[PDB]
């Protein structure tokens, strides 16, 4: 069917420029008109950019007009967006999408998204996470059930991974959506319940890996 | 049994301000046929965007 495949995005500093591309297939590229919509936490669903099939027109939103740039590649089937002098308020979801085919004098809008592809404007530079223990203890005890975990404190950027016990603990487990700290850095906490008669000799470890900067952390959580 | 010629010449103002909902649904053939100069110009943002084809 239908695919859209975006690519480019990445961790870019403020200032600087960046050029996302979209590959489509199942459908003739150069027959349709396209959009770019971005996907924030704070802003929703926002439009960004529309671009016709022959490229004639062209569309911005207010709050990008004169710094984006959307074009396209017929012969190649690939669409393209250069987004200079990026602020921080621009970090969003991506998406390329296609127009929908409809009558003459119909207005338009889009059918089909894309995959999608992450842009994060921060000046926060590459910085591997803290992994600390939450430990359990009598505080942390409620009948036969007790809870562990741990911190993964001031990283950047995202994303990381977590797993227990090399991934044979899954039955109980919690990992939280990381939140943005004020100093730019990521931080998120994972906790897992377990019977309170294994405390004390069954070993719980926390495997921390973070690809873009080859991180990997063992932390063991030791009750108090 | 005729009509007052002093009577009240003004418009009530407590008269009835909605909409009659039994008034003409048609549409009127006698109105204005022409085009509208001062109608909107400039191109349409959402129009179509793709071939004919």
């Known amino acids: 069917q239908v695919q859209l495949v975006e690519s480019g995005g990445g961790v870019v500093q403020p200032g600087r420029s960046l050029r996302l591309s979209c590959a489509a297939s199942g459908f003739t590229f150069s027959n349709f008109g396209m959009h770019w919509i971005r996907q924030s936490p704070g802003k929703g669903l926002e439009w960004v950019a529309i671009?016709?099939?022959?490229?004639?027109?062209?569309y911005y939103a207010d709050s990008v007009k004169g710094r984006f740039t959307i074009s396209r590649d017929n012969s190649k089937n690939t669409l393209y967006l250069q987004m200079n002098s990026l602020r921080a308020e621009d970090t969003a979801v991506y998406y390329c999408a296609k127009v929908w085919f409809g009558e003459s004098e119909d207005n338009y809008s889009v059918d089909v998204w894309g995959q999608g592809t992450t842009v994060t404007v921060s000046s926060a530079s590459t910085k591997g996470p803290s992994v600390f223990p939450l430990a359990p203890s009598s505080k942390s005890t409620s009948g036969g059930t007790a809870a562990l975990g741990c911190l993964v404190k001031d990283y950047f950027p995202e994303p990381v991974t977590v797993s227990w016990n090399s991934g044979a603990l899954t039955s109980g487990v919690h990992t939280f959506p990381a939140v943005l700290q004020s100093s730019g850095l990521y931080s998120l906490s994972s906790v897992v319940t377990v019977p309170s008669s294994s405390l004390g000799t069954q070993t719980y470890i926390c495997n921390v890996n973070h690809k873009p900067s080859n991180t990997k952390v063992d932390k063991k959580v030791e009750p108090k | 049994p005729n009509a007052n010629p002093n009577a009240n010449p003004n418009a009530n103002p407590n008269a009835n301000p909605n909409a009659n909902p039994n008034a003409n649904p048609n549409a009127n053939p006698n109105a204005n046929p022409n085009a509208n100069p001062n109608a909107n110009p400039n191109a349409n943002p959402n129009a179509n965007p793709n071939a004919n084809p």
């Open positions: 671009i016709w099939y022959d490229g004639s027109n062209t």
